Design a protein around this motif. Structure first.
Motif, PDB file in Angstrom:
ATOM      1  N   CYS A   6       0.356  -1.577  -2.946  1.00 52.73           N
ATOM      2  CA  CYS A   6      -0.361  -0.933  -1.863  1.00 52.73           C
ATOM      3  C   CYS A   6      -1.611  -0.229  -2.362  1.00 52.73           C
ATOM      4  CB  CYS A   6       0.543   0.069  -1.124  1.00 52.73           C
ATOM      5  SG  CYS A   6       1.833  -0.777  -0.241  1.00 52.73           S
ATOM      6  N   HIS A  59      -4.022  -2.720   1.610  1.00 47.87           N
ATOM      7  CA  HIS A  59      -2.680  -3.253   1.752  1.00 47.87           C
ATOM      8  C   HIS A  59      -1.665  -2.132   1.983  1.00 47.87           C
ATOM      9  CE1 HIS A  59       0.653  -5.809   1.646  1.00 47.87           C
ATOM     10  NE2 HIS A  59       1.147  -5.284   0.541  1.00 47.87           N
ATOM     11  N   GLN A  60      -0.774  -2.356   2.936  1.00 45.16           N
ATOM     12  CA  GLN A  60       0.224  -1.350   3.307  1.00 45.16           C
ATOM     13  C   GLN A  60       1.684  -1.804   3.216  1.00 45.16           C
ATOM     14  OE1 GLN A  60       0.028   1.886   4.508  1.00 45.16           O
ATOM     15  NE2 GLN A  60      -2.089   2.200   5.139  1.00 45.16           N
ATOM     16  N   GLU A  65       4.930  -5.216   3.697  1.00 45.07           N
ATOM     17  CA  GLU A  65       5.400  -6.591   3.853  1.00 45.07           C
ATOM     18  C   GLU A  65       6.374  -6.594   5.026  1.00 45.07           C
ATOM     19  OE1 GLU A  65       6.202  -9.081   0.383  1.00 45.07           O
ATOM     20  OE2 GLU A  65       8.259  -9.336   1.141  1.00 45.07           O
ATOM     21  N   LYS A 108       6.301   2.711   8.729  1.00 46.27           N
ATOM     22  CA  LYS A 108       7.652   3.240   8.625  1.00 46.27           C
ATOM     23  C   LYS A 108       8.592   2.074   8.366  1.00 46.27           C
ATOM     24  CE  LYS A 108       7.837   5.222  12.458  1.00 46.27           C
ATOM     25  NZ  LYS A 108       7.823   5.790  13.841  1.00 46.27           N
ATOM     26  N   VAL A 143      11.130   0.216   9.158  1.00 49.42           N
ATOM     27  CA  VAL A 143      11.987  -0.235  10.253  1.00 49.42           C
ATOM     28  C   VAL A 143      11.491  -1.620  10.623  1.00 49.42           C
ATOM     29  CG1 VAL A 143      12.329   0.030  12.757  1.00 49.42           C
ATOM     30  CG2 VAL A 143      12.625   1.992  11.213  1.00 49.42           C
TER      31      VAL A 143
HETATM   32  C1  YDL Z   1       3.168  -0.894  -1.395  1.00 51.84           C
HETATM   33  N1  YDL Z   1       3.222  -0.758  -2.653  1.00 51.84           N
HETATM   34  C2  YDL Z   1       4.294  -1.699  -0.749  1.00 51.84           C
HETATM   35  C3  YDL Z   1       3.955  -3.175  -0.693  1.00 51.84           C
HETATM   36  C4  YDL Z   1       5.235  -4.080  -0.305  1.00 51.84           C
HETATM   37  C5  YDL Z   1       6.123  -4.014  -1.283  1.00 51.84           C
HETATM   38  C6  YDL Z   1       6.920  -5.500  -1.286  1.00 51.84           C
HETATM   39  N2  YDL Z   1       5.937  -6.398  -1.016  1.00 51.84           N
HETATM   40  C7  YDL Z   1       4.748  -5.611  -0.336  1.00 51.84           C
HETATM   41  O1  YDL Z   1       3.722  -6.024   0.063  1.00 51.84           O
HETATM   42  N3  YDL Z   1       4.491  -1.162   0.605  1.00 51.84           N
HETATM   43  C8  YDL Z   1       5.764  -0.647   1.065  1.00 51.84           C
HETATM   44  O2  YDL Z   1       6.723  -0.684   0.342  1.00 51.84           O
HETATM   45  C9  YDL Z   1       5.829  -0.107   2.387  1.00 51.84           C
HETATM   46  C10 YDL Z   1       5.974   1.465   2.399  1.00 51.84           C
HETATM   47  C11 YDL Z   1       6.923   1.772   3.301  1.00 51.84           C
HETATM   48  C12 YDL Z   1       6.335   2.016   4.740  1.00 51.84           C
HETATM   49  F1  YDL Z   1       5.637   0.911   5.176  1.00 51.84           F
HETATM   50  F2  YDL Z   1       5.514   3.088   4.713  1.00 51.84           F
HETATM   51  F3  YDL Z   1       7.345   2.254   5.635  1.00 51.84           F
HETATM   52  C13 YDL Z   1       7.912   0.445   3.327  1.00 51.84           C
HETATM   53  N4  YDL Z   1       7.114  -0.628   3.029  1.00 51.84           N
HETATM   54  C14 YDL Z   1       7.371  -2.031   3.269  1.00 51.84           C
HETATM   55  O3  YDL Z   1       6.515  -2.810   2.946  1.00 51.84           O
HETATM   56  C15 YDL Z   1       8.703  -2.450   3.898  1.00 51.84           C
HETATM   57  N5  YDL Z   1       8.384  -3.319   4.975  1.00 51.84           N
HETATM   58  C16 YDL Z   1       8.790  -2.965   6.328  1.00 51.84           C
HETATM   59  O4  YDL Z   1       9.469  -1.974   6.516  1.00 51.84           O
HETATM   60  O5  YDL Z   1       8.378  -3.787   7.375  1.00 51.84           O
HETATM   61  C17 YDL Z   1       8.829  -3.285   8.623  1.00 51.84           C
HETATM   62  C18 YDL Z   1       9.570  -3.129   2.798  1.00 51.84           C
HETATM   63  C19 YDL Z   1       8.949  -4.423   2.284  1.00 51.84           C
HETATM   64  C20 YDL Z   1      10.985  -3.412   3.406  1.00 51.84           C
HETATM   65  C21 YDL Z   1       9.733  -2.141   1.601  1.00 51.84           C
END
Ligand code: YDL
Ligand code: YDL
Lengths: 304, 304
Positions: B148, B166-167, B169, B191, B193
């Motif tokens: 991210c 990037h935030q 997946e 978030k 979820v």
């Molecule tokens: C940033 N370093 C990561 C990038 C993510 C990791 C796996 N592949 C990617 O692109 N971003 C996150 O982990 C976010 C942060 C949290 C939130 F978004 F703020 F809630 C959870 N993140 C997710 O990407 C989750 N996705 C999700 O909840 O989609 C609804 C997952 C991948 C389950 C951790």
């Protein structure tokens, strides 16, 4: 997750690109330490490109026949204090060592291997992409007039392994260039005469890596208990425009992580090579061979 | 000649990447002038990611809660002298202006538009690739934990137009992030979820550009006199998972250079969308929608 066509960050190599001019001809060069590499055809007049005598062209030059300019980043005009030919490349010695020379090696890549290309015009980088050295010793690039001297490279840690200097277009979208020993990939001649190429083939080991990438992203409809041995597959491959399969530790790691044997995917290839019949694998309806086992391990598992 | 997945040279943006740490959380940030942008979820503890209160997290922080370090190139630790939230992003003011800040703008991209991504981990660039903003406001990237704050951008001349941070997946190989106004593409919530996505669709205007690229590389077996009007095609597209076609000057230049009308290629799409039946276009057995009209004009004709 996700598998894409990925290239190395290009900044370290951008800092090594220069423009090289010899008379009315201009192209790019690579400046490392006190040496500038560039294609030798920069010495050839347009009217002699069909039958050049590079030995005679070289002796007709002095150090002052070449002008080397760095445009991007730290600008500079570099004085040429020596000139030599190695194969299809010139080695120009300049009076100033590049203060941004990275740790580097020179290597010659093999069919199926992937590398990053930094496309440049007039010494200025314009794009980057990744190619695979094809079984017929060409690459499928995107290059226009003035792109020669653009470089291809791999990276091991901080070390850049330079493996390609762009030289020519052999057919639509079909390119070749030199290794830094001066040998042209595929032994093509830097002369403007049509030169037949061998037929292209699918890189079987990269197809296997891509099928593993599919399994790792939740796509395994093509996996069945049936198996085809490497020996049997390799006789089949020679009859159907596929390369012979050679296993590696990188492939073995994917077989272990997924629990699917190489031989199961060799069988799958023999069923899928005629079409997926409306089905899809990682968003494609054909076998993909531009992702290496190492690329898959890196992108999906972070492992080098 | 040749058409490939091409990204911008990344060096100018590499010089702007930093690592941002807040407590036990770390990710990447973008340092321009005296500002460092990064995702606001760096403030959230893992155990609260499913229901964060970002307003409360922000007020619990001081300037010293954030640590900004530049690793690559000119190393440095930057002191945070201010902190603010804009949408899903943090804006940290630092005491030193980035001496390598490029000329830049901030822009929000639209479905079908392409941009280059610089993937980074711990403030260190590791790869670059090009994506298209999908009609469902996701991108198909390649990102792992720690990615991210990786940035996406276009370039107009020397000016960098930053358009993506990037935030998250959302599904296998399916990603989203923020524009630099802090709005999340697709309005997804930062978030943890599950959040449903709309179905993806083919970007019809990019399919047309790619068919033109084929004609320009000697491949026109799909061109017939038959035509389908834009209006008729657009009603058909809504029924068959294609975007509605909007012509542009960039497309018009391709129609002029090739002499093939847009309406002929709209007809072709309606025949090819069910399969090419063993035939191939630019080495593919399916319609490709990741090449924009601008990308095609640039790579094939050098024209911007
Ligand atoms: C940033 N370093 C990561 C990038 C993510 C990791 C796996 N592949 C990617 O692109 N971003 C996150 O982990 C976010 C942060 C949290 C939130 F978004 F703020 F809630 C959870 N993140 C997710 O990407 C989750 N996705 C999700 O909840 O989609 C609804 C997952 C991948 C389950 C951790
Ligand atoms: C270097 N700037 C160009 C790159 C070439 C231009 C079009 N797309 C490309 O990749 N290299 C050349 O023009 C070489 C130089 C001459 C020679 F190789 F030394 F003989 C001719 N070049 C060619 O690429 C020719 N190809 C060819 O003769 O294949 C047998 C063409 C493309 C006809 C000029």
């Amino acid at each position: 997750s996700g598998l894409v066509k990925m290239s190395h960050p290009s900044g370290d190599v951008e800092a090594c690109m220069v423009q090289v001019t010899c008379g009315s001809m201009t192209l790019n060069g690579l400046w490392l330490d006190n040496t500038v590499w560039c294609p030798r055809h920069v010495m050839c007049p347009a009217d002699q490109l069909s039958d050049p005598n590079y030995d005679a062209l070289l002796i007709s030059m002095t150090n002052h026949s070449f002008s080397v300019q760095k445009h991007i980043g730290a600008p500079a005009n570099l004085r040429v204090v020596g000139h030599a030919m190695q194969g299809t490349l010139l080695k120009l010695t300049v009076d100033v060592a590049n203060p941004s020379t990275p740790a580097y090696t020179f290597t010659t890549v093999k069919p199926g291997a992937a590398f990053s290309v930094l496309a440049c015009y007039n010494g200025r980088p314009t794009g980057t992409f990744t190619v695979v050295m094809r079984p017929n010793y060409t690459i499928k690039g995107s290059f226009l007039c003035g792109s020669c001297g653009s470089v291809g490279y791999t990276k091991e840690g901080s070390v850049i392994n330079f493996c390609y200097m762009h030289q020519m277009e052999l057919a639509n979208g079909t390119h070749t260039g030199s290794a830094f020993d001066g040998t042209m990939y595929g032994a093509f001649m830097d002369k403007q005469v049509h030169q037949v190429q061998l037929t292209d083939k699918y890189c079987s080991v990269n197809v296997v890596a891509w099928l593993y990438a599919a399994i790792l992203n939740g796509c395994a409809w093509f996996v069945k208990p049936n198996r085809t041995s490497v020996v049997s597959f390799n006789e089949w491959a020679l009859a159907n425009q596929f390369t012979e399969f050679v296993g590696t530790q990188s492939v073995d790691m994917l077989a272990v992580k997924t629990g699917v044997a190489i031989e199961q995917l060799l069988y799958a290839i023999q069923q899928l090579y005629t079409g997926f019949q409306g089905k899809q694998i990682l968003g494609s309806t054909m076998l993909e061979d531009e992702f290496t086992p190492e690329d898959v391990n890196m992108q999906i598992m972070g492992v080098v």
